[PDB]
Amino acid sequence: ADPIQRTPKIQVYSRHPAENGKSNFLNCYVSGFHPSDIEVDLLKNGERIEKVEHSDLSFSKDWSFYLLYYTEFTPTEKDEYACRVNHVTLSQPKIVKWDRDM
Amino acid sequence: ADPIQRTPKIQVYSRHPAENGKSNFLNCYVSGFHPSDIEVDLLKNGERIEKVEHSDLSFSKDWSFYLLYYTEFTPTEKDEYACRVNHVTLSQPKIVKWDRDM
Amino acid sequence: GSHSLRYFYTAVSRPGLGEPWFIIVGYVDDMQVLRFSSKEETPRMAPWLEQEEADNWEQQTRIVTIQGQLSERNLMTLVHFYNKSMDDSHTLQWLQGCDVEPDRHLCLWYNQLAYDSEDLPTLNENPSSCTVGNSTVPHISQDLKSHCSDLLQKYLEKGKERLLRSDPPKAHVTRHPRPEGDVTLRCWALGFYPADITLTWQLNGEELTQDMELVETRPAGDGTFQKWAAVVVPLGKEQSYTCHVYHEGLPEPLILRWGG
Amino acid sequence: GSHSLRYFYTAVSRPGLGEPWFIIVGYVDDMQVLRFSSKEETPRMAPWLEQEEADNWEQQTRIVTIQGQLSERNLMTLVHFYNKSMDDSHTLQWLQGCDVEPDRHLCLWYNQLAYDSEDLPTLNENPSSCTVGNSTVPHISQDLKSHCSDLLQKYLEKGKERLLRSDPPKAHVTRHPRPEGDVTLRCWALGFYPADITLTWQLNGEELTQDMELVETRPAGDGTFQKWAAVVVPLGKEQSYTCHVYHEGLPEPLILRWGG
Amino acid sequence: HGKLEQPEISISRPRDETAQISCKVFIESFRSVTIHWYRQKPNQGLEFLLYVLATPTHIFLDKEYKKMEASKNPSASTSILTIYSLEEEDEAIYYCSYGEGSSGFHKVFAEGTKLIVIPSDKRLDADISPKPTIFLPSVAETNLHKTGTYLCLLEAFFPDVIRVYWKEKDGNTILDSQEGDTLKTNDTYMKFSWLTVPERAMGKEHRCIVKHENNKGGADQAIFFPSIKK
Amino acid sequence: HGKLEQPEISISRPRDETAQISCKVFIESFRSVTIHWYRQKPNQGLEFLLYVLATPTHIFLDKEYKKMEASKNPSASTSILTIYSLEEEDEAIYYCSYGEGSSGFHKVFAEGTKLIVIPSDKRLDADISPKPTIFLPSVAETNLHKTGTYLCLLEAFFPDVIRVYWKEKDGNTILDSQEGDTLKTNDTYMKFSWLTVPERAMGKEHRCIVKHENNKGGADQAIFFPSIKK
Amino acid sequence: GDQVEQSPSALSLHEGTDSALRCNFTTTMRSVQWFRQNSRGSLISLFYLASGTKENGRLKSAFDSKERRYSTLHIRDAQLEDSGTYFCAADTWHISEGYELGTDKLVFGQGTQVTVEPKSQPPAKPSVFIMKNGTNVACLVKDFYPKEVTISLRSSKKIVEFDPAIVISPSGKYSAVKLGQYGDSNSVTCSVQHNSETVHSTDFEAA
Amino acid sequence: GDQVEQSPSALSLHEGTDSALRCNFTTTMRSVQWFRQNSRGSLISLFYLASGTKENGRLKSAFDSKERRYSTLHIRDAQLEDSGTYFCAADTWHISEGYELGTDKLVFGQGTQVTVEPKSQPPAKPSVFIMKNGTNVACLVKDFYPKEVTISLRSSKKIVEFDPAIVISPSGKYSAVKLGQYGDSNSVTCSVQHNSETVHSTDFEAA
Ligand SMILES: *[C@]1(O)O[C@H](CO)[C@@H](O[C@@]2(O)O[C@H](CO)[C@@H](O[C@]3(O)O[C@H](CO)[C@@H](O)[C@H](O)[C@@H]3O)[C@H](O)[C@H]2NC(C)=O)[C@H](O)[C@H]1NC(C)=O
Ligand SMILES: *[C@]1(O)O[C@H](CO)[C@@H](O[C@@]2(O)O[C@H](CO)[C@@H](O[C@]3(O)O[C@H](CO)[C@@H](O)[C@H](O)[C@@H]3O)[C@H](O)[C@H]2NC(C)=O)[C@H](O)[C@H]1NC(C)=O
Ligand SMILES: *[C@]1(O)O[C@H](CO[C@@H]2O[C@@H](C)[C@@H](O)[C@@H](O)[C@@H]2O)[C@@H](O[C@@H]2O[C@H](CO)[C@@H](O)[C@H](O)[C@H]2NC(C)=O)[C@H](O)[C@H]1NC(C)=O
Ligand SMILES: *[C@@]1(O)O[C@H](CO)[C@@H](O[C@@]2(O)O[C@H](CO)[C@@H](O)[C@H](O)[C@H]2NC(C)=O)[C@H](O)[C@H]1NC(C)=O
Ligand SMILES: *[C@]1(O)O[C@H](CO)[C@@H](O[C@@]2(O)O[C@H](CO)[C@@H](O)[C@H](O)[C@H]2NC(C)=O)[C@H](O)[C@H]1NC(C)=O
């Protein structure tokens, strides 16, 4: 491969301490990847959550790219979540299961 | 510096299409080994056959050496033969079972 | 305590769509203060900056836009300089900006470009300084390199609250049992602005810095960043592992322990 | 038909017993015709040779001996130039010979030596000529290079029976199936003379040069060579595989299928 | 006949004075141009001086309290290199160039012109132009080698760099001839070239096209090799 | 004071006469040594000639049954290269060399000898040998630099093959000197080299040493150079 | 300033040898240019590149981006039509007052002057010629070998002499002329000595 | 001598400069040797090889085992004390009409005149003094950089003046000396013009 490619580093997390019951935001912060175009979507129990705004596409000193997604959801101790991320890579899209620990 | 040594190759077979009963000669051929110091003995159902002669030491294009040890044997359906060759290049003396086709 | 301002220009190529794609995020000491792109006529500045009635500062807008226009020809020129088929998506990332701090009269300016992720040999030495100007000489001209010391100081007085702050770390550890027999000690740090923060686990006075788990210090999304560093520890030795959470928005070393 | 005489000098050292070890087998085509080493006063040539009360081989006797002789110094001046501990055994291989072919008045003089296993840079362009022409009579004829041809002649004439002969290859194919679903067809070639035999498996159509098991062609103690090449054939087809055997003896390339 | 031309090989003008060096560009779109000027000393590389926007940005060379050289772009379709207050170290060869491509450089360069600094000794003493004097082929060569040579030995000048050149006048096609180095003559210079006459085409005259800053008139000398009868 | 070195550095002998070069050998293994001889022409590189076996068994060079030269090896622990039938393309630099005892090879050559073939002159009678001309330091320099330079000027010498080094003759050792390339004097040859003596060593006597074939008696020149204090 | 270094300050080769020029700078560049200066002073571009390898004829310029700071130019089968002063040069992106992605100034190196001397093969004999006329005399020679040469002279009324000038003929040999201000108003002759063999221009003059 | 080609026929470098000398033979060679012979003295020896690559001081060179036909010699951080001619010579095993595995004959390349010129250096101002010898006045120009120089001896009854001597001084600067013979000897002062300035012997002689 000649076009210097860089694959994204994904993290999914709550903006504040997750206390299922009340509102907060679902964040998926993709960064460290390069080739601009990136498809990042949210998920709920398996489907595609919507009406999600994203950040002002900027980069790091290493000319790497970073984007942040976030939504207005109501945390519950039974609604499994994960981030949907696919971009110029090898394997199939990448889904990141949200976890209490991080 | 590190000398370039070449292990010995071995081929044990009958001079003529062997038929147990009528005579034939047993041949343990060795070739491609470099350091000429080499030990080669035939075996009749397990032991080192009395006296076996061999050819005069010659070598090939890549200076590798080759010798063939032949003996007078009377193949007999229920008598196994094989070759014993020990070189500066191998772990323990190698034995070569003599099968009638190969 | 050096403060700063940078603009990250980003432009892309689309397989024969005529007009390219692009943007221009701008920041100051880790806080976004400005913005611009195609199919946009103006610089939606930071809402948190209530400027007074008339926009007396847009010479930077002059700057950006032309950069928008010019953006094309560049990706154009860049494409022929290197043998590159106009059929393959291309991108040109550019970054200008500068630092600031009185004492030594600090004012260095960064201007760097990259083709498809490739530093582009600019002749001028890199981090160049800039604080002086001839006598009786207004330099109102097009350049941004001369409006740093000016435009930085401009952004830091129209929204001081969000640029003069220092939200310290709220840290706490957490125990999570390992079916394997070990226990992960996750030292969190939440709500802190000056992104540059460092957490660290020590074991009998020896930092375990290079042999611990660490996450790219991700963005809260509301105005600050979060970060947690962790370790695996013997079922028991817990109370022996400490978590030093440094940061200057915290006088002395914040130190944690936890377990249960 | 071309022809070629060869001498294989081979020498070894051991401790400091001084007495180096050596042999000088000399072949003509694939028939060894001369033996001579240490512990032999005379070059003991091959039995099967019309001998006519003639101590007229001296020239060959002379040459060989010396060669055997310098083996003392030679084998030695070769240790120091490399300063290799005279405690580790060493060997000095030498090869001279020529391939004549009057139908083209051709002659090629070979002369290669090698120390432990590496060739020795010599002034010679290894393959050279052995037919010299000036308009004179005297000379010093005592260079193995200037007789090789003649000697070859001698051997050929004094041996036309065994040397100038072609004993074709007798060939059969064997079917001795293997465990896991695919028969093994071994093509045989026995007692053919010049070792150069090329056996080949195929499908009427093409050859299977890339998927075969080939035994380097071995010798049988009567002055003939035998070789085999086999492959894995499906128990079904089992016959659309022919064995084309090629050799100097049989004009009509031998073709082999199984029994029926 | 050109992509960048630079008349006047050399220019010699008195100490602490102003000098004129210009290259007539021949390329339209002459406005969206950027012309770099270059300096080459005795045995040094070639260094950069300035760039012109092909539209009198009048980019000038200022070095702390000093305006040193000027870049410009008139109607005569040329850029001129103005050099102020001449001192010796400023004595060197000057080149004008630009870059073929929007994003690049096939880098097109010119012949360049060497600036000559002159102190006192004369008030334009004499003319100071090449002084010809031709030489006839050798009857000795014609006779024995059926070959001929002819030349044009000059003298009495000050144009340090006078580059000589010949070509078959009829089909005036520059044809590499050969000459020897420049030798001094009590603060005057004089070169001597020549040729290997194509054995069978020796007619009446081919031409010794000389050229110098100070040469009678201001045109390349046209020199011929007439025949005889007396 | 030697591993293998040659006597004279230049040899000028008559056309069609004999010339033999020499090379003092210094290895006891002598009887069982091998001495090598190469020649060299003006910037060409050493060319082999002959080898001298362990003691006699002399070898030589016939040119189709007419000898050209011969290496020898006598009592005086040295070998010798003779040259008969002298001609110009036989004039060069001859070198001696030996190959380490037990077949080793850090090959050693000597300083070599230039073989000059001299034509004719009445009966060649003239004093052609070095001729000094000392010059002491310059007070200016002494005064201002606290240095002192000397000039060793030799002329009216012939071979044209001299070696001149400034040895601090109070103690045998060499001093970084400078020297002018040898210029040809109409029918002879001349040469000079200087020495820059530092301060704290100005007090010592230095001697410039000339070594040249045709030079009086047959020994190097002893040129002493005072050292004074005022 | 100071940030470029050409390999040999000068170098000379035989017809049919193979050598290379190197030159490096560490201030990252966009491209390295290669030129040949004629005696006329004209600047002949040889190669152009911002990426790896290129080749044509015998000259080949090599520049590679592992740092984009060093470039080499090798020569194979070097022929007479090559000698000259070679230069390496580097250009770099120039950013306008606006944002026009242009090209900054070119940086050259010191000068490595190539000098390609001819093959050495069985010599030949030098045929002198006559060239003089009016208090002026200068000998000639067509295709001889070594720079080694001495153009003797035969005049009646002598004055000071000057330095010669040996060029390099087409065939591959040397040639030359030795200036000389003499008299002998139409009469002069030349004499040459080379390789112990002398040649009087007279030896060719016939009638 | 039909089997060894020395790469550079000539080469020059400033201190700190770098370079290589190639040398390949028209026949298998067993061992290679690289010599360096100064002005006109002995042949010093730098390397002996039979396979591989050795490196002494700054120099490095090699013979590539599997080829036995090519040798290379590099000079790094060149320095004035590396001037002089380099020679590469190799050999090969021989075989007597009696199988004596001998090896004597040593082939030499054509040689390479390596010349190290001084670092580019800010011009230097000479010092001029006058050596004397009734009828003999010598002009000594000292520690000046740019070689470009003009020395003249102001005298009236000038007998014979010789060309000037210009040797690379110790410190890497240039130096010169020039003799001649005169009548007014004692009067004779020497004037030096270098780098547009003028320096007089006189300028220093105290008084
Ligand atoms: C030898 O002396 O060389 C000189 C210089 O090249 C020759 O001088 C002349 O005569 O060359 C030609 C031939 O006569 C002259 O050309 C003429 O005479 O020019 C004038 C114009 O001024 C006009 O009459 C015609 O145009 C002629 O062609 C030329 O003027 C002479 N050169 C000078 C300046 O003196 C000379 O002839 C030659 N000697 C011999 C014997 O060949
Ligand atoms: C300047 O004039 O050069 C001349 C000629 O080279 C120098 O002349 C002398 O003195 O040079 C040496 C040094 O004194 C003399 O050598 C001595 O004197 O030779 C005699 C033998 O005759 C003996 O005393 C010792 O062997 C000395 O070395 C030499 O003889 C002189 N030359 C002649 C022939 O006159 C002269 O010294 C020098 N001037 C100065 C001030 O340096
Ligand atoms: C120039 O000579 O380049 C070298 C750097 O080494 C070379 O470059 C790399 C990228 C490869 O091509 C590799 O093959 C070469 O090694 C510099 O030369 C010297 O390098 C020394 C170590 O190799 C180092 O010790 C010296 O400091 C360094 N400079 C010196 C003192 O010569 C050099 O700087 C470059 N330009 C030059 C010669 O000025
Ligand atoms: C050189 O060898 O010979 C010439 C010519 O004979 C010598 O020239 C001079 O100098 O000889 C004497 C001695 O000075 C003078 O009177 C003549 O006028 C000169 N001849 C001419 C006409 O030039 C020259 O001296 C000599 N060279 C050397 C170094 O001895
Ligand atoms: C001698 O010097 O050996 C070298 C190295 O093998 C040869 O170099 C070249 O020229 O070999 C081939 C033939 O031109 C080229 O393709 C190689 O690129 C080049 N080797 C290198 C890396 O320089 C020489 O040609 C050879 N000399 C002669 C006169 O044969």
PDB file of C-alpha atoms and ligand atoms in Angstrom, chain F residues 132-136 222 224 226, chain H residues 132-134, ligand 2:
ATOM      1  CA  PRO F 132      72.716  25.498  -2.050  1.00  0.00           C
ATOM      2  CA  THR F 133      71.825  29.148  -1.440  1.00  0.00           C
ATOM      3  CA  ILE F 134      70.646  29.670   2.127  1.00  0.00           C
ATOM      4  CA  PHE F 135      68.265  32.357   3.200  1.00  0.00           C
ATOM      5  CA  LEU F 136      67.680  32.996   6.947  1.00  0.00           C
ATOM      6  CA  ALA F 222      74.544  18.779   4.918  1.00  0.00           C
ATOM      7  CA  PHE F 224      73.046  23.635   8.519  1.00  0.00           C
ATOM      8  CA  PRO F 226      71.773  28.814  12.373  1.00  0.00           C
TER       9      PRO F 226
ATOM     10  CA  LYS H 132      67.593  37.833   0.944  1.00  0.00           C
ATOM     11  CA  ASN H 133      70.890  36.780  -0.569  1.00  0.00           C
ATOM     12  CA  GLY H 134      72.974  39.378  -2.421  1.00  0.00           C
TER      13      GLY H 134
HETATM   14  C1  LIG I   2      73.474  34.046   1.695  1.00  0.00           C
HETATM   15  O1  LIG I   2      74.366  35.009   1.227  1.00  0.00           O
HETATM   16  O2  LIG I   2      73.660  32.854   0.934  1.00  0.00           O
HETATM   17  C2  LIG I   2      75.034  32.454   0.923  1.00  0.00           C
HETATM   18  C3  LIG I   2      75.190  31.375  -0.132  1.00  0.00           C
HETATM   19  O3  LIG I   2      74.304  30.297   0.120  1.00  0.00           O
HETATM   20  C4  LIG I   2      75.459  32.043   2.330  1.00  0.00           C
HETATM   21  O4  LIG I   2      76.865  31.736   2.281  1.00  0.00           O
HETATM   22  C5  LIG I   2      77.471  30.837   3.152  1.00  0.00           C
HETATM   23  O5  LIG I   2      77.852  31.469   4.332  1.00  0.00           O
HETATM   24  O6  LIG I   2      76.558  29.780   3.470  1.00  0.00           O
HETATM   25  C6  LIG I   2      77.078  28.838   4.458  1.00  0.00           C
HETATM   26  C7  LIG I   2      76.664  29.338   5.835  1.00  0.00           C
HETATM   27  O7  LIG I   2      77.681  30.129   6.435  1.00  0.00           O
HETATM   28  C8  LIG I   2      78.598  28.633   4.303  1.00  0.00           C
HETATM   29  O8  LIG I   2      78.959  27.307   4.733  1.00  0.00           O
HETATM   30  C9  LIG I   2      80.187  27.185   5.364  1.00  0.00           C
HETATM   31  O9  LIG I   2      80.746  28.419   5.704  1.00  0.00           O
HETATM   32  O10 LIG I   2      81.089  26.539   4.459  1.00  0.00           O
HETATM   33  C10 LIG I   2      82.455  26.568   4.931  1.00  0.00           C
HETATM   34  C11 LIG I   2      83.281  25.743   3.961  1.00  0.00           C
HETATM   35  O11 LIG I   2      83.816  26.552   2.923  1.00  0.00           O
HETATM   36  C12 LIG I   2      82.546  26.056   6.383  1.00  0.00           C
HETATM   37  O12 LIG I   2      82.868  27.136   7.246  1.00  0.00           O
HETATM   38  C13 LIG I   2      81.231  25.406   6.836  1.00  0.00           C
HETATM   39  O13 LIG I   2      81.006  24.217   6.093  1.00  0.00           O
HETATM   40  C14 LIG I   2      80.044  26.361   6.653  1.00  0.00           C
HETATM   41  O14 LIG I   2      78.838  25.612   6.616  1.00  0.00           O
HETATM   42  C15 LIG I   2      79.002  28.839   2.847  1.00  0.00           C
HETATM   43  O15 LIG I   2      80.387  28.581   2.679  1.00  0.00           O
HETATM   44  C16 LIG I   2      78.712  30.280   2.446  1.00  0.00           C
HETATM   45  N1  LIG I   2      78.522  30.358   1.013  1.00  0.00           N
HETATM   46  C17 LIG I   2      79.430  30.962   0.254  1.00  0.00           C
HETATM   47  C18 LIG I   2      80.081  30.124  -0.831  1.00  0.00           C
HETATM   48  O16 LIG I   2      79.752  32.144   0.402  1.00  0.00           O
HETATM   49  C19 LIG I   2      75.215  33.220   3.290  1.00  0.00           C
HETATM   50  O17 LIG I   2      75.470  32.808   4.618  1.00  0.00           O
HETATM   51  C20 LIG I   2      73.773  33.766   3.177  1.00  0.00           C
HETATM   52  N2  LIG I   2      73.639  35.003   3.933  1.00  0.00           N
HETATM   53  C21 LIG I   2      72.992  35.039   5.095  1.00  0.00           C
HETATM   54  C22 LIG I   2      73.087  36.334   5.890  1.00  0.00           C
HETATM   55  O18 LIG I   2      72.343  34.090   5.543  1.00  0.00           O
END
